Amino acid sequence: SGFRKMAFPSGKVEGCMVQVTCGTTTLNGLWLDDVVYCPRHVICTSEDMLNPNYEDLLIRKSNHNFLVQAGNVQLRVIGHSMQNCVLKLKVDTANPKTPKYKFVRIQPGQTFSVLACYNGSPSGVYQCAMRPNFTIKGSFLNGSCGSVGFNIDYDCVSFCYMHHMELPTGVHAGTDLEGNFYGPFVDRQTAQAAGTDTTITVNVLAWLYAAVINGDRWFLNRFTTTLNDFNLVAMKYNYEPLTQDHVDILGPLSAQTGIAVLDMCASLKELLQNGMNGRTILGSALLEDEFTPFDVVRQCSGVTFQ
Amino acid sequence: SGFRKMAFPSGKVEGCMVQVTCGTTTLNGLWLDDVVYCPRHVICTSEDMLNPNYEDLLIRKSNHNFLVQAGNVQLRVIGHSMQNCVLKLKVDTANPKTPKYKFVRIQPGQTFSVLACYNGSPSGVYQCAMRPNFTIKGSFLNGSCGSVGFNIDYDCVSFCYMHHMELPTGVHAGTDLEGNFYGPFVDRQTAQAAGTDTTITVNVLAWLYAAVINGDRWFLNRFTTTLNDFNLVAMKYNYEPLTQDHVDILGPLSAQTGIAVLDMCASLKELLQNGMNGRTILGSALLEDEFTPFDVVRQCSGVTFQ
Numbered sequence A, B: 001s002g003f004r005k006m007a008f009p010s011g012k013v014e015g016c017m018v019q020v021t022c023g024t025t026t027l028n029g030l031w032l033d034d035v036v037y038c039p040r041h042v043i044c045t046s047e048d049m050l051n052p053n054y055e056d057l058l059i060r061k062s063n064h065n066f067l068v069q070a071g072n073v074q075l076r077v078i079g080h081s082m083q084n085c086v087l088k089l090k091v092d093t094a095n096p097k098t099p100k101y102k103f104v105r106i107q108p109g110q111t112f113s114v115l116a117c118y119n120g121s122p123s124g125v126y127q128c129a130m131r132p133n134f135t136i137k138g139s140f141l142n143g144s145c146g147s148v149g150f151n152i153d154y155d156c157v158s159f160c161y162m163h164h165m166e167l168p169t170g171v172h173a174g175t176d177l178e179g180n181f182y183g184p185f186v187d188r189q190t191a192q193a194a195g196t197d198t199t200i201t202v203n204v205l206a207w208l209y210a211a212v213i214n215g216d217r218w219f220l221n222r223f224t225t226t227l228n229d230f231n232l233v234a235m236k237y238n239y240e241p242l243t244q245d246h247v248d249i250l251g252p253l254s255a256q257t258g259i260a261v262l263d264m265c266a267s268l269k270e271l272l273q274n275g276m277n278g279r280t281i282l283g284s285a286l287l288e289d290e291f292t293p294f295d296v297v298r299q300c301s302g303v304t305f306q
């Protein structure tokens, strides 16, 4: 038993991380097939990033201005193109370690694993959730751009994130693998505001179902409620509105534990109106919202990957 | 910036995970060079595990009674030996993916990364700390034995843990890679008690230094204290006694933030005597003790691995 936040095995992604250098700027790149993906601001200096005209900046750059290093071996760049906020460097060698991969654009509330890299070398892996305001709360130092977020079905790597920015608030913003930013963010060193960060309600309920599975029981109360009544209290505490869909994905955990979703919603209702009273749930003194209803089943059914 | 609990890249360990079957029992094995390491209770049935005589049980087993599977390829076992609570299966093929590796026995309070596996296939990775009572709080379902814990310097994998048991309390116990259990535990399905779980004081102080680095400041107070005075209050809250050694490892974070260790100890002293008042530090409403003083520097200096 036991419940922890768990990142996917990063072995398949490690084989695709390369170092990309342009001028004096160095970041990480994603080498899939014969294409290297990296943030387009690799063509930017520190002064360029204040107000960059990426088109005018990319005009001055050629193929030989891009040094792609895979450990100690170099990839000869034979073409480059700017797709939105990402750069696609065509190399003359296909990556022999390319797994079966996809490019997906996740939805708010869904989670993924981040392989933090510097100089194209992995440093650590952790689980991140795309907040409803399309930010993430990760760990990114200088040189961490180009690092990717991903999910794995069994042998298929679903790339979904690439890191670009840290906002003035300390949270992080990025794009998908097509260069499109998550949220209303642009890759420019200027003050940028995300919306009000709300709580992924279906995720806290799934995390409460996991605690119920793992022996944490004190929170289980005796009330029930309705979908609109709970949403009136959920909107009071900046929680996402629970839809009939969210009830359907939680069905698996509800049908196994025998607690109706509206019953769990009532136990969550009192948990917001009365606090934790100095108690903990699964070793945390607050409500966790970074566990999707599929992340708990993944940890209770024991799925694997090859 | 930002601070998260981070697991090492598990790519090098994934290449050493194989499936080990004996009779009807299947668990994970560690394939390094031409030796496969796995818990010795692979020779046990469900009824054997109540009171096993491992010697008498291993007498009945031969080399061909051990099926070692690496994906779809089998490893021919040509020898077996019981070292403490671990089984060493000699195969006729050296693992071509063996990294530079060591076998170490960690100290209480130190952390490591756990690659959770089932049927020799990785499932997830998370960071664990060896509690002062020589247990860990992980996530282990049925079939998770043989999974290992490890640390990486740069290209050297330091294996330190192998999973065996879940206690009646829900926490987990295991051995090093030499078969010696951490703590007073034996691999037998019987009621077994760990001691009183105490808090790794040097780890909470290092985690407070990280919050100080990442903008979390409200806890910083104005008192100071002495080593004995703080230990009198630390022992009151079941905290490990802080030694002059612990002050020396915290020197790096103390000399960078400019807060003396005894000053941080006073801010921690009031944090125990006054609680958090419904506030959070680094997104947690309690004091984290699973971050060693080297784990914060690892996340603030940005070390990498190859």
Ligand SMILES: *[C@H](CC(=O)OC)[C@@H](C[C@@H]1CCNC1=O)NC(=O)[C@H](CC(C)C)NC(=O)OCc1ccccc1
Pocket (backbone or CB within 6 Å): A025, A026, A027, A028, A041, A042, A049, A140, A141, A142, A143, A144, A145, A146, A164, A165, A166, A167, A187, A188, A189, B001
């Ligand atoms: C990407 C550049 C890189 O890593 O390698 C060239 C980022 C820096 C990362 C983002 C998270 N922390 C970092 O150090 N460089 C940037 O200039 C971007 C903005 C756009 C050009 C994408 N991020 C940014 O300006 O972040 C502000 C910041 C806050 C705290 C610390 C460093 C930067």
Ligand SMILES: *[C@H](CC(=O)OC)[C@@H](C[C@@H]1CCNC1=O)NC(=O)[C@H](CC(C)C)NC(=O)OCc1ccccc1
Pocket (backbone or CB within 6 Å): A001, B025, B026, B027, B028, B041, B042, B049, B140, B141, B142, B143, B144, B145, B146, B164, B165, B166, B167, B187, B188, B189
């Ligand atoms: C190892 C066996 C295995 O995984 O594959 C053969 C363990 C089961 C693991 C330990 C953590 N959770 C599991 O399911 N089998 C055991 O019998 C051991 C005891 C010794 C023989 C090592 N663990 C044990 O008895 O755990 C009790 C338990 C609690 C909760 C759920 C399952 C088992």
